[PDB]
Each structure stands twice: as C-alpha cells, then as structure tokens.
Amino acid sequence: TNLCPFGEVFNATRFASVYAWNRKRISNCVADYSVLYNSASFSTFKCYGVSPTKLNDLCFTNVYADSFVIRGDEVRQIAPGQTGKIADYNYKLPDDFTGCVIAWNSNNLDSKVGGNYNYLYRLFRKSNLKPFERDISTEIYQAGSTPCNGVEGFNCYFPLQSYGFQPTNGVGYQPYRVVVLSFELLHAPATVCGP
Amino acid sequence: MQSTEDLVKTFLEKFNYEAEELSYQSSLASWNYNINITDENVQKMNNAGAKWSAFYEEQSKLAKTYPLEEIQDSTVKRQLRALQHSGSSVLSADKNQRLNTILNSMSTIYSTGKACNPSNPQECLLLEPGLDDIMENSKDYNERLWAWEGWRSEVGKQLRPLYEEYVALKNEMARANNYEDYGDYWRGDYEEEWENGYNYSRNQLIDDVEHTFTQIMPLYQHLHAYVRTKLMDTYPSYISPTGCLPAHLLGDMWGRFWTNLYPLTVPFGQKPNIDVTNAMVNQSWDARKIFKEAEKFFVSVGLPNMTQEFWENSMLTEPSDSRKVVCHPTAWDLGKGDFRIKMCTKVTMDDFLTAHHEMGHIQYDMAYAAQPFLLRNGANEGFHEAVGEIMSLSAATPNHLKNIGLLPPSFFEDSETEINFLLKQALTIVGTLPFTYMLEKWRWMVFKGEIPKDQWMKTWWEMKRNIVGVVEPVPHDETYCDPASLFHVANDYSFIRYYTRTIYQFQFQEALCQIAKHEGPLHKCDISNSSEAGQKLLEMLKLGKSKPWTYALEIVVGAKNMDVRPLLNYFEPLFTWLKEQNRNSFVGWNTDWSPYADQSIKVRISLKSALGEKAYEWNNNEMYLFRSSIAYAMRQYFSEVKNQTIPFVEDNVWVSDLKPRISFNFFVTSPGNVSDIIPRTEVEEAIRMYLEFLG
Ligand SMILES: *[C@@H]1O[C@H](CO)[C@@H](O)[C@H](O)[C@H]1NC(C)=O
Ligand SMILES: [Zn+2]
C-alpha cells in the first residue's frame, strides 16, 4: 500500500511556469483515481484514449504528471491538435495523446493586487515544439535579418514574457493551474495500477 | 526572407501584450480614483497614465519605421494606421506644452468661471449647478438673459484669445500630420481606404452631413414653428411670429436640447406621460433589481449575461460613508476581461433607462474583446452611444414596461400621449441636430481658414439665424467666443459625434425591429425576446474596428451609408401632426429680425476719401470713442431732462450689423439691466442735443 503521491503534484503551494513545465514520474504505487474525477474542484477533466471511469482497472508502466499554470483563455490549447502560443511554443501534446488534462481556477492563489508576474510563457520561437518537448532557452529572438548580439532591440525581442495576474481580471485572463497525466505502457513491468 | 508584414505582425504581438497590461494599470488607477477621490489616487492615476502614454508614443515612432505600403493584409494594416498616428507628437516641446497650457486653461476657466447677478454682485454663480439651474428651469425673460449674456461675457471673452492660439496650434499640428486642417484631422475618424466599395472619404463626410440635413430641415421647421407658437403664450412681449427664436429661451445655456421646454410646448398637458418611478419604489425596487432586470433584457435578445466580476467590482450605488466619487454615469472597459459600470443609481425611470444604455456599452465592449488591442473600439466614433441608445428606446416602451410588471395589464396608450412622447423625443433628438450641424460646420470653417478671426462671431450668429433659426438677444462683437462657451468646444471634443450617432440609432432600430417582425409605428417597437435580432446585432458588435464602418453598418441595416429616412420615419406621426398645427402659422424664420432691431439706430459712416485709404477709415477703437460719445450723451440727457444720475458706459452701447468702416446699428441699455433697452426716440433726443442717422 504505497499510494501514488498525487498530493505533491496537485496540492503544491507553487506551480512552475509553462515554458519550464514541471514533470514528476510516478511509479510502483497504487493510484486512486476516484479522488481526482469525483472531485468538484476541477473545471477541466478531459481525458483522451483513456476514460475517467475504467481507470482503476488498468495498469501502466509509468505515469507522468505535467503541472503548470496558464491563463483561462489558453486551457483549450492543452489538447491534441491545438494551435496557439502555449501549444506551439510552451507545451505541446501529441496527436495520439493518451491521458487526462486536468485544470482548475487558481485566482485564489496565483493572483495578487498590483499584479503577480512570477509566471512566464514563451512568446517567440523559431519553430513549433515537438510533443512533450521543453524549451527553457533564453536567447534573444531575432525576427529580422540583423544579429541581436544578445541584447533586446529593434526586431530583436526577449522570448519569455510574464503573465499579469490581478484578482480583478476576467476569468479568461485569470490563472488556471493545469495538470496533465500521461499514461505509459511499454515493454516494462507495468508499475502503476491502483484498485 | 521575412516580409515586412511578417515583421510588423511580430512587432504587434510584442506591442499587444504590454499595451494590454499598461492600459489596465492606467484604467485601474483611474477607476479607483473615480470611486474614491483622494490626493494620492490622483497621482497614481497620473503616474500610470503617463507610463501608458510614454509607452504608446514610444511604440508609435517605432511603428512609422514600417512602410504601410508593403502590407497587403487588411486587419494588420488597421493596427499600424491606428498606431502610426502621432497626433500632437509632431510638434516641438515648446509648442506642445504651450498647446497643453491653453487646453488646461480653457478647461479650468470653463469649470471655475462664474457669472455674477447684476442685482447682487456678491451672488456669483458657476455654470453647474448655478447657471444651468436657471437656464433649464426658469421662465423669466430677464433672469435668463443676464445668465445667458453673463456666461458668455465674464467667461466667454476670456476664451477668445486662448481659442485663437488654440486653432493656430492645432492646425499647425494637423498639417504636419499631412492633413488639411484640424477639422480635416477630426474627419479622419470616418475616413476609410478598404479595397473597393466600402471606402469612405473625408470630404464625403462633409457632403453626407449636408445631404442628410436638408432632409431634416422640413421636420425641423415645423417643430421650430410649433415651439415658436407655444412660447408666445409663455413669453408674450418678447418673440415675433416671423423671426428667429431668442437664444436664451431654448431650455439650456446654448439651446443644445429643447427638452426643458416640454412643459411650455406640451401638446396635451392634460395627460401626463409614462413615468415608472413611483411604480418601482412601491415594488421595493433597488439598484441591483434595475441592473439584473436590465441584464435579463439583453439575454432575452440573445446576448450573454454579465460577468460575475462585473457584480463584484462595479459601483452601482453611491457609497453611504465618507467617500467623494465621480458619478457622472460611465461604462468602463478596463481590459483583460474587466468590465464595470460606475453610477450613482437612484430608483427612477431615467436611471432605469440609462442602465440599459450603459449596459449596452458593456455588451459592445465584451463583443469585440476578442479583437487585437488596437481594434477594440466602435467602428467609428458614433457606434457606441448609438448602440446604447437603441436599448433605452426599446426599454422605455409601454410594451416592455407591461412585461416586467411596471405597467399594469390594464394599459392602453391613447392618441394624444404618443404625440406627447414623440414631441419630447423631438425636442431632444430633432432639436439638437441643427445645433450639432452648425457648430461643427463653424469649427470646420474656422480650422480651414474660411472665416477670418475678425468675423468669427459675425458669421457664428449669421448661421445660427439661418441654419438653426436662433437669434442673439444682444449683439456680440469679436471679443466674444460664444462657441467656446460649450463644454465640447473649450475641451477639444469633436461634436459631429452626436449628429451621426443620432442617424445611426434609428437606422439600427428600424432594421432590428423588422427582424423582430414588429408591426405598427416605429416608436412602438420592442426588440425584447427576439434572439434573431440581437444575434444579427451581435455580428456587428464582434467586428469592432476590424472592418470599415460602412461594412459594419451594412451587416445590420443593409446599407453602407448614413440614411436619415429611418429617423424621419420615426417622427412621421409627429410630423403629420405638426403640419396641421401649423396651418395658420408661419413655417420658417426671417433672419432679419432681432429682439433689439425694434429700437436700434441705423448709422452710415462718412467716407471722406476713397474706400481703402486708412487715413481716417473708422476701425474698432474709433467705434470705442463713438460708443463713449453716445454714452456721454445719454448721461447728460437723463441728468438734465430727467434729473437722473445714471452711469452709462461703452458696454451699454451695443453695435450690431457692423460692416467695418461703412455702416452699423446701435442701441443703448441701462447699466446693470441689459433687459432694459432705452427707447430709441428718447436716444435720438439725446443725440440731437449734442455721420448719417436715418431720421
Ligand atoms: C489536498 O490536501 C487536502 C488536505 O490538506 C486533502 O483533503 C485533499 O484531498 C488534497 N488534494 C489532493 C488533490 O491531493
Ligand atoms: Zn453612454
């Protein structure tokens, strides 16, 4: 009876910015998924390939929990085949993604009067991300033909931008804490099951 | 390998994300000030506003780096055209703040200037609420005269030297922006260069305003003739059934709206019009009930509900405690999904329909919120206040009030009450169009240079007589700047905003009601419970400024230009009634007439040499000695003939119909009483005891 540490991923006091989305590998434990789908705390519980039900009856060789924070407008981009600043430049899910995307409003925690600018996102990139690729680069994006020389200038912009999280924003601009569960079935011992 | 359009698209995405945040900080600083006025909230507003301004001017110069010619996409071209617009960023640091010095000065002189009662010099009254209370409520000829003349003399004369340097600097600014003048600068609001068909010129706005006006003048003359006949019963001894109307008897300081003349020109005063104020306080209606029932009106036509953030952050009541607030009603689009309304809501019918009006601004703001930050606005400067006004038109109907319980199921509107309603609407909607038409045409001429500064007032009053049918009670020389006595003129605000909006209201209204399958007169329509009407309306609200306003207008009305025919269709039941009420009347005014030409003296100056020789050739200060000479003759007359010591000065000698160096008329008023005109043959007697005089 080693229950999978879902509390450290969901109940974490602070999440990571999506450009540096944090991943924790869950293995050889017992996962109760009833605590997750039967919870009214989440605004988004879309699952792909797998289903919310019929999940305590399967066995995966690993489980990855990608947790991050975007705006409410960009939660729809966390899905297979979607396009946008988040899906193209920050966090991309494969077309054949098998897992669950979980999100919930966190205006209670991640917004502050005057502004909360600790959450970042990548605004410019030379090419789109491959599925499950992470880019923590900080080179100056050159949009034109002149070298930036590592300093911001004309047609030379810093790639990473900060979110403006005031509690008075509309829910479209409010912070949403997203958790993406990816399920792994390999040539491997099939670690995580859960009754 | 990257096109310029691809470079500006990257540049705009870099502009959008800090402009959206810096504009949110400036509005949030301005909102906290408007709901709590302190001395540290003003600077927080001025700090965030300066940071937002300095950032916009910074990106505005980087925007001109990109040639607008090498961009074939259309939606991206509009953001550059709106961003590459400098404004006053084209002037020197010397000329810029000197211009800002004048605008600030004209604003304080307007907001702090006073006019003192000639009967009591210690009773000096501001415009709000002092002078406006007189001009909007009083029916005394002399009481309204000294308030009308006083406001334009004590305060209006101070703005004339400021407005002269104002016109010079604003034109100087507009010409550096490759515009004709400052009036052509304002007319760029409606200018469009789309591909083809949906274009619009700046000179076309001039042609379209004049074409619509001559279609309005038939309706205005019968309304002018009817009001002229009815105010005879209110002001006998003062108006002639053939001439213009005196400027100080039109319901307010300038004659902008004739709404306050309704008790004097009521068609059937026996019957009152619909007021639901009492029906609301007996039903325990409060501020939230007004906005929630207004919210259920927009969702009934297919529009979204109000955000929950709108119900937690908006201020819909005046604070009970010690908190000075600005609560001139406004609707706020702070950005980032933050929309609120600031209002000292009372439980009244007027505050009930303004709630639907200001909430209509919110629904418009939330619709184009998906557009880029530089395209989040109305199609032109008149779409916003027009969309809000069509909401109050349908909400004030007996049909709508019958459905929400404020009027009983035992309701029936008679023939006379709608004549009462359509006239009260005409005094507000129709009466302001010739005033709005002439004020902008005057400023357009002044900015163009068509009227010299030595004839600013001489032309201003010639068009009020000809276009509006309004005559001065006393002549105003070139020391007055009567146009600057209005808020929109002394504060650099365009005024054609209120003319085109009026045409846009009933253009939208007639089109939306035909979708709602409305039958009967247009003033009876109500778009409530009509989803296919609001969703067709929502189609234009989504566009915002991403498409030309000719396109956005055609999505709703089916026409790409201003059409006054729906407006005349709205007032056809009244236009049919005014004509039968004006059969035994004069329809029209005679520009010759004045309230003082009855006792003025014609004067022909002697040309002792060829015209064009400044040897003698009387000019302004030769007229000063003449007005002082007659003032002396009036002093000796009353003292020797009547044993009355009366201090006549040059300001008591009013000169009218002045043609410089040749001719003019003049009459004399008693000191402290501009209402008391000295009889003419009594004045001619004073001149005989001590040029041509025609008699
Ligand atoms: C978070 O912690 C609370 C108690 O601290 C617990 O009841 C809840 O189940 C936890 N949630 C998750 C998702 O682990
Ligand atoms: Zn409004």
Coordinates of N, CA, C and O in Angstrom, one line a residue, chain B residues 429-557:
Chain B
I429 N -34.0 64.9 -29.6 CA -33.4 64.3 -30.8 C -33.3 65.2 -32.0 O -32.3 65.3 -32.6
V430 N -34.5 65.8 -32.3 CA -34.5 66.6 -33.5 C -34.0 68.0 -33.3 O -33.3 68.6 -34.2
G431 N -34.3 68.6 -32.1 CA -33.8 69.9 -31.8 C -32.3 70.1 -31.8 O -31.9 71.2 -32.0
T432 N -31.6 69.0 -31.5 CA -30.1 69.1 -31.3 C -29.4 69.0 -32.7 O -28.2 69.3 -32.8
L433 N -30.1 68.4 -33.7 CA -29.4 68.2 -35.0 C -29.0 69.5 -35.7 O -27.8 69.6 -36.1
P434 N -29.8 70.5 -35.8 CA -29.3 71.7 -36.4 C -28.3 72.4 -35.6 O -27.4 73.1 -36.2
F435 N -28.4 72.4 -34.3 CA -27.3 72.9 -33.4 C -26.0 72.1 -33.6 O -25.0 72.7 -33.7
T436 N -26.1 70.8 -33.6 CA -24.9 70.0 -33.8 C -24.4 70.2 -35.2 O -23.1 70.1 -35.4
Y437 N -25.2 70.3 -36.2 CA -24.8 70.5 -37.5 C -24.0 71.8 -37.7 O -23.0 71.9 -38.4
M438 N -24.5 72.9 -37.1 CA -23.9 74.2 -37.3 C -22.6 74.4 -36.5 O -21.8 75.2 -37.0
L439 N -22.5 73.8 -35.3 CA -21.4 74.0 -34.5 C -20.1 73.4 -35.2 O -19.0 74.0 -35.1
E440 N -20.3 72.2 -35.7 CA -19.1 71.6 -36.4 C -18.8 72.2 -37.7 O -17.6 72.4 -38.0
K441 N -19.8 72.6 -38.5 CA -19.6 73.4 -39.7 C -18.8 74.7 -39.5 O -18.0 75.1 -40.3
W442 N -19.1 75.3 -38.3 CA -18.4 76.6 -38.0 C -17.0 76.2 -37.6 O -16.1 76.9 -38.1
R443 N -16.7 75.2 -36.8 CA -15.4 74.9 -36.5 C -14.6 74.3 -37.7 O -13.4 74.5 -37.8
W444 N -15.3 73.6 -38.6 CA -14.7 73.2 -39.8 C -14.2 74.3 -40.7 O -13.2 74.3 -41.3
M445 N -15.1 75.4 -40.7 CA -14.7 76.6 -41.5 C -13.5 77.3 -40.8 O -12.6 77.8 -41.5
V446 N -13.6 77.4 -39.5 CA -12.5 78.2 -38.7 C -11.2 77.4 -38.9 O -10.2 78.1 -39.1
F447 N -11.2 76.1 -38.7 CA -10.0 75.4 -38.9 C -9.5 75.5 -40.3 O -8.3 75.5 -40.6
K448 N -10.4 75.5 -41.3 CA -10.0 75.6 -42.7 C -9.5 77.0 -43.0 O -8.7 77.1 -44.0
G449 N -9.9 78.0 -42.2 CA -9.5 79.3 -42.5 C -10.5 80.1 -43.4 O -10.2 81.2 -43.9
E450 N -11.7 79.5 -43.6 CA -12.7 80.2 -44.4 C -13.2 81.5 -43.8 O -13.6 82.4 -44.5
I451 N -13.4 81.5 -42.4 CA -13.9 82.6 -41.7 C -12.7 83.3 -41.0 O -12.1 82.6 -40.1
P452 N -12.3 84.5 -41.3 CA -11.3 85.2 -40.5 C -11.7 85.4 -39.1 O -12.8 85.5 -38.7
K453 N -10.6 85.6 -38.3 CA -10.9 85.9 -36.8 C -11.6 87.2 -36.6 O -12.2 87.3 -35.5
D454 N -11.5 88.2 -37.5 CA -12.2 89.4 -37.3 C -13.7 89.3 -37.6 O -14.4 90.3 -37.5
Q455 N -14.2 88.1 -38.0 CA -15.6 87.9 -38.3 C -16.0 86.5 -37.7 O -17.0 85.9 -38.3
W456 N -15.4 86.0 -36.7 CA -15.7 84.7 -36.1 C -17.2 84.8 -35.6 O -18.0 83.9 -35.9
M457 N -17.5 85.8 -34.7 CA -18.8 85.9 -34.2 C -19.8 86.4 -35.2 O -21.0 86.0 -35.1
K458 N -19.4 87.3 -36.1 CA -20.4 87.8 -37.1 C -20.9 86.7 -38.0 O -22.0 86.7 -38.4
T459 N -20.0 85.7 -38.3 CA -20.5 84.6 -39.0 C -21.2 83.6 -38.1 O -22.3 83.1 -38.5
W460 N -20.7 83.4 -36.9 CA -21.3 82.4 -36.0 C -22.8 82.7 -35.8 O -23.6 81.8 -35.7
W461 N -23.2 84.0 -35.6 CA -24.6 84.3 -35.4 C -25.4 84.4 -36.7 O -26.6 84.3 -36.7
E462 N -24.7 84.6 -37.9 CA -25.4 84.5 -39.1 C -25.9 83.1 -39.5 O -26.9 83.0 -40.1
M463 N -25.1 82.1 -39.1 CA -25.5 80.7 -39.3 C -26.5 80.2 -38.3 O -27.4 79.4 -38.6
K464 N -26.4 80.7 -37.0 CA -27.5 80.4 -36.0 C -28.8 80.9 -36.5 O -29.8 80.3 -36.3
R465 N -28.8 82.1 -37.1 CA -30.1 82.7 -37.6 C -30.5 81.9 -38.8 O -31.7 81.6 -39.0
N466 N -29.6 81.5 -39.7 CA -30.0 80.9 -41.0 C -30.3 79.4 -40.8 O -31.3 78.9 -41.3
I467 N -29.3 78.7 -40.2 CA -29.4 77.3 -40.1 C -30.3 76.8 -38.9 O -31.3 76.1 -39.1
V468 N -30.0 77.3 -37.7 CA -30.8 76.9 -36.5 C -32.1 77.7 -36.4 O -33.0 77.2 -35.7
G469 N -32.1 78.9 -36.9 CA -33.3 79.7 -36.6 C -33.3 80.4 -35.3 O -34.3 80.6 -34.7
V470 N -32.1 80.7 -34.8 CA -31.9 81.3 -33.4 C -31.2 82.6 -33.6 O -30.2 82.7 -34.3
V471 N -31.7 83.6 -32.9 CA -31.2 85.0 -32.9 C -30.6 85.4 -31.6 O -31.1 84.9 -30.5
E472 N -29.5 86.2 -31.6 CA -28.9 86.7 -30.4 C -29.9 87.7 -29.7 O -30.6 88.4 -30.4
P473 N -30.0 87.7 -28.4 CA -30.7 88.7 -27.7 C -30.0 90.0 -27.7 O -30.6 91.1 -27.7
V474 N -28.6 90.0 -27.8 CA -27.8 91.2 -27.8 C -26.6 90.9 -28.7 O -26.1 89.8 -28.7
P475 N -26.2 91.9 -29.5 CA -25.1 91.7 -30.4 C -23.7 91.4 -29.7 O -23.4 92.0 -28.7
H476 N -22.9 90.5 -30.3 CA -21.7 90.1 -29.8 C -20.6 90.5 -30.8 O -20.6 89.9 -31.9
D477 N -19.6 91.3 -30.4 CA -18.5 91.7 -31.3 C -17.5 90.6 -31.3 O -17.7 89.5 -30.7
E478 N -16.3 90.9 -31.8 CA -15.2 89.9 -31.9 C -14.4 89.7 -30.6 O -13.4 89.1 -30.6
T479 N -14.9 90.3 -29.5 CA -14.4 90.0 -28.2 C -15.0 88.8 -27.5 O -14.4 88.2 -26.6
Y480 N -16.2 88.3 -28.0 CA -16.9 87.1 -27.6 C -16.3 85.9 -28.4 O -15.8 86.0 -29.5
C481 N -16.5 84.8 -27.7 CA -16.2 83.5 -28.4 C -17.3 82.5 -28.0 O -17.0 81.4 -27.6
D482 N -18.6 82.9 -28.1 CA -19.8 82.2 -27.7 C -19.7 80.7 -28.0 O -20.2 79.9 -27.2
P483 N -19.2 80.2 -29.2 CA -19.0 78.8 -29.4 C -18.1 78.1 -28.3 O -18.4 77.0 -27.9
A484 N -17.1 78.8 -27.8 CA -16.3 78.3 -26.7 C -17.0 78.1 -25.4 O -16.4 77.5 -24.5
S485 N -18.2 78.7 -25.3 CA -19.0 78.6 -24.0 C -19.5 77.2 -23.9 O -20.1 76.9 -22.8
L486 N -19.4 76.3 -24.8 CA -19.8 74.9 -24.7 C -18.7 74.0 -24.3 O -17.5 74.3 -24.5
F487 N -19.0 73.0 -23.5 CA -18.0 72.1 -23.0 C -17.2 71.4 -24.1 O -16.0 71.3 -23.9
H488 N -17.9 70.9 -25.1 CA -17.2 70.2 -26.2 C -16.2 71.1 -27.0 O -15.3 70.6 -27.6
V489 N -16.5 72.4 -27.0 CA -15.6 73.3 -27.8 C -14.4 73.7 -27.0 O -13.3 73.7 -27.5
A490 N -14.6 74.1 -25.7 CA -13.5 74.5 -24.9 C -12.6 73.4 -24.4 O -11.5 73.6 -23.8
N491 N -13.0 72.1 -24.7 CA -12.2 71.0 -24.2 C -11.8 70.1 -25.3 O -11.5 68.9 -25.1
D492 N -11.7 70.6 -26.6 CA -11.1 69.9 -27.7 C -11.9 68.6 -28.0 O -11.2 67.5 -28.2
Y493 N -13.2 68.6 -28.0 CA -14.0 67.4 -28.3 C -14.8 67.6 -29.6 O -15.4 68.7 -29.8
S494 N -14.7 66.6 -30.4 CA -15.5 66.7 -31.7 C -17.0 66.6 -31.4 O -17.4 66.0 -30.4
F495 N -17.8 67.3 -32.2 CA -19.2 67.4 -32.0 C -20.1 66.7 -33.0 O -21.2 66.4 -32.7
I496 N -19.5 66.3 -34.2 CA -20.2 65.5 -35.1 C -20.5 64.1 -34.6 O -21.3 63.4 -35.2
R497 N -19.9 63.8 -33.5 CA -20.1 62.5 -32.8 C -21.6 62.4 -32.5 O -22.2 61.3 -32.6
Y498 N -22.3 63.4 -32.1 CA -23.7 63.4 -31.7 C -24.6 63.5 -32.9 O -25.8 63.3 -32.7
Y499 N -24.1 64.0 -34.0 CA -25.0 64.1 -35.2 C -25.1 62.7 -35.9 O -26.3 62.3 -36.2
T500 N -24.0 62.1 -36.2 CA -24.1 60.8 -36.9 C -24.6 59.7 -36.0 O -25.3 58.8 -36.5
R501 N -24.4 59.8 -34.7 CA -24.9 58.8 -33.8 C -26.5 58.8 -33.8 O -27.1 57.8 -33.8
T502 N -27.0 60.0 -33.9 CA -28.5 60.1 -34.0 C -29.1 59.4 -35.2 O -30.1 58.8 -35.2
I503 N -28.4 59.6 -36.4 CA -28.8 58.9 -37.6 C -28.6 57.4 -37.4 O -29.4 56.6 -37.9
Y504 N -27.5 57.0 -36.7 CA -27.2 55.6 -36.6 C -28.2 54.9 -35.7 O -28.4 53.7 -35.8
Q505 N -28.8 55.6 -34.7 CA -29.7 54.9 -33.8 C -30.9 54.3 -34.5 O -31.2 53.1 -34.5
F506 N -31.7 55.2 -35.2 CA -32.9 54.7 -35.8 C -32.6 53.9 -37.1 O -33.5 53.2 -37.6
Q507 N -31.4 54.1 -37.7 CA -31.0 53.1 -38.7 C -30.9 51.7 -38.2 O -31.4 50.8 -38.8
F508 N -30.2 51.6 -37.0 CA -30.2 50.3 -36.4 C -31.5 49.9 -35.9 O -31.9 48.7 -36.0
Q509 N -32.3 50.8 -35.4 CA -33.6 50.5 -34.7 C -34.6 49.9 -35.7 O -35.2 48.9 -35.4
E510 N -34.7 50.6 -36.9 CA -35.7 50.1 -37.8 C -35.3 48.7 -38.4 O -36.2 47.9 -38.7
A511 N -34.0 48.5 -38.6 CA -33.6 47.2 -39.1 C -33.8 46.1 -38.1 O -34.1 45.0 -38.5
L512 N -33.5 46.3 -36.9 CA -33.6 45.3 -35.9 C -35.1 44.9 -35.6 O -35.4 43.8 -35.2
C513 N -36.0 45.9 -35.7 CA -37.4 45.6 -35.5 C -38.1 44.8 -36.6 O -39.0 44.0 -36.4
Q514 N -37.7 45.1 -37.9 CA -38.1 44.3 -39.0 C -37.7 42.8 -38.8 O -38.4 41.9 -39.3
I515 N -36.5 42.6 -38.2 CA -36.1 41.2 -37.9 C -37.0 40.7 -36.8 O -37.3 39.5 -36.8
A516 N -37.4 41.5 -35.9 CA -38.3 41.1 -34.8 C -39.8 41.0 -35.2 O -40.6 40.9 -34.4
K517 N -40.0 41.2 -36.5 CA -41.4 41.1 -37.1 C -42.3 42.1 -36.4 O -43.5 41.9 -36.2
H518 N -41.8 43.3 -36.1 CA -42.6 44.4 -35.5 C -43.5 45.0 -36.5 O -43.2 45.3 -37.6
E519 N -44.8 45.1 -36.1 CA -45.8 45.8 -36.9 C -46.3 47.0 -36.2 O -46.4 47.1 -34.9
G520 N -46.7 48.1 -36.9 CA -47.1 49.3 -36.4 C -46.1 50.4 -36.5 O -45.1 50.3 -37.2
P521 N -46.3 51.5 -35.8 CA -45.4 52.6 -35.8 C -44.0 52.2 -35.2 O -43.9 51.3 -34.4
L522 N -43.0 52.9 -35.6 CA -41.6 52.6 -35.2 C -41.4 52.9 -33.8 O -40.6 52.1 -33.1
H523 N -41.9 53.9 -33.2 CA -41.7 54.3 -31.8 C -42.4 53.3 -30.9 O -42.3 53.5 -29.7
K524 N -43.2 52.3 -31.4 CA -43.8 51.3 -30.6 C -43.0 50.0 -30.5 O -43.5 49.1 -29.8
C525 N -41.9 49.9 -31.2 CA -41.2 48.6 -31.3 C -40.5 48.3 -30.0 O -40.2 49.2 -29.2
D526 N -40.3 47.0 -29.8 CA -39.5 46.5 -28.7 C -38.9 45.2 -29.1 O -39.5 44.3 -29.5
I527 N -37.5 45.2 -29.0 CA -36.7 44.1 -29.6 C -36.6 43.0 -28.5 O -35.8 42.1 -28.7
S528 N -37.3 43.1 -27.4 CA -37.2 42.1 -26.4 C -37.7 40.7 -26.8 O -38.5 40.6 -27.7
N529 N -37.1 39.7 -26.3 CA -37.5 38.3 -26.6 C -37.3 38.0 -28.1 O -38.0 37.2 -28.6
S530 N -36.3 38.6 -28.7 CA -36.0 38.5 -30.1 C -34.6 38.1 -30.3 O -33.7 38.9 -30.3
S531 N -34.3 36.8 -30.4 CA -32.9 36.3 -30.5 C -32.3 36.6 -31.8 O -31.1 37.0 -31.9
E532 N -33.1 36.4 -32.9 CA -32.6 36.7 -34.3 C -32.2 38.1 -34.5 O -31.5 38.5 -35.5
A533 N -32.8 39.1 -33.7 CA -32.4 40.5 -33.8 C -31.1 40.8 -33.1 O -30.2 41.4 -33.7
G534 N -30.9 40.3 -31.9 CA -29.7 40.6 -31.1 C -28.5 39.9 -31.7 O -27.4 40.4 -31.7
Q535 N -28.7 38.6 -32.2 CA -27.5 37.9 -32.8 C -27.1 38.6 -34.1 O -25.9 38.6 -34.4
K536 N -28.0 39.1 -34.9 CA -27.7 39.9 -36.1 C -27.0 41.2 -35.6 O -26.0 41.7 -36.2
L537 N -27.4 41.8 -34.5 CA -26.7 42.9 -33.9 C -25.4 42.5 -33.4 O -24.4 43.2 -33.5
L538 N -25.3 41.3 -32.7 CA -24.0 40.8 -32.2 C -23.0 40.6 -33.3 O -21.8 40.6 -33.0
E539 N -23.4 40.4 -34.5 CA -22.5 40.2 -35.6 C -21.6 41.5 -35.8 O -20.4 41.4 -36.1
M540 N -22.3 42.6 -35.8 CA -21.5 43.9 -35.9 C -20.7 44.2 -34.7 O -19.6 44.7 -34.7
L541 N -21.3 43.9 -33.5 CA -20.6 44.2 -32.2 C -19.3 43.4 -32.1 O -18.3 43.8 -31.5
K542 N -19.2 42.2 -32.8 CA -18.0 41.4 -32.8 C -16.9 42.1 -33.6 O -15.7 41.9 -33.3
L543 N -17.3 42.7 -34.7 CA -16.3 43.3 -35.6 C -15.5 44.4 -35.0 O -14.3 44.5 -35.2
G544 N -16.1 45.2 -34.2 CA -15.4 46.3 -33.5 C -14.9 47.3 -34.5 O -15.7 48.0 -35.2
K545 N -13.6 47.4 -34.6 CA -12.9 48.3 -35.6 C -12.1 47.5 -36.6 O -11.3 48.0 -37.3
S546 N -12.3 46.1 -36.7 CA -11.5 45.3 -37.6 C -12.0 45.5 -39.0 O -11.2 45.2 -40.0
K547 N -13.2 46.0 -39.3 CA -13.7 46.2 -40.6 C -14.2 47.6 -40.7 O -14.5 48.3 -39.7
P548 N -14.2 48.2 -41.9 CA -14.7 49.6 -42.1 C -16.1 49.7 -41.6 O -16.9 48.8 -41.7
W549 N -16.4 50.9 -41.1 CA -17.8 51.2 -40.5 C -18.9 51.1 -41.6 O -20.0 50.9 -41.2
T550 N -18.5 51.3 -42.9 CA -19.5 51.0 -43.9 C -19.8 49.5 -44.0 O -21.0 49.2 -44.3
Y551 N -18.9 48.7 -43.8 CA -19.1 47.2 -43.7 C -19.9 46.9 -42.5 O -20.9 46.2 -42.6
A552 N -19.5 47.4 -41.3 CA -20.2 47.1 -40.1 C -21.6 47.6 -40.1 O -22.5 47.0 -39.5
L553 N -21.9 48.7 -40.8 CA -23.2 49.3 -40.8 C -24.1 48.4 -41.8 O -25.3 48.3 -41.5
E554 N -23.5 47.9 -42.8 CA -24.3 47.1 -43.8 C -24.7 45.8 -43.2 O -25.7 45.2 -43.7
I555 N -23.9 45.2 -42.3 CA -24.2 43.9 -41.7 C -25.6 44.0 -40.9 O -26.3 43.0 -40.8
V556 N -26.0 45.2 -40.5 CA -27.2 45.4 -39.7 C -28.3 46.0 -40.5 O -29.5 45.5 -40.5
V557 N -28.0 47.1 -41.2 CA -29.1 47.9 -41.9 C -29.3 47.4 -43.4 O -30.4 47.6 -43.9

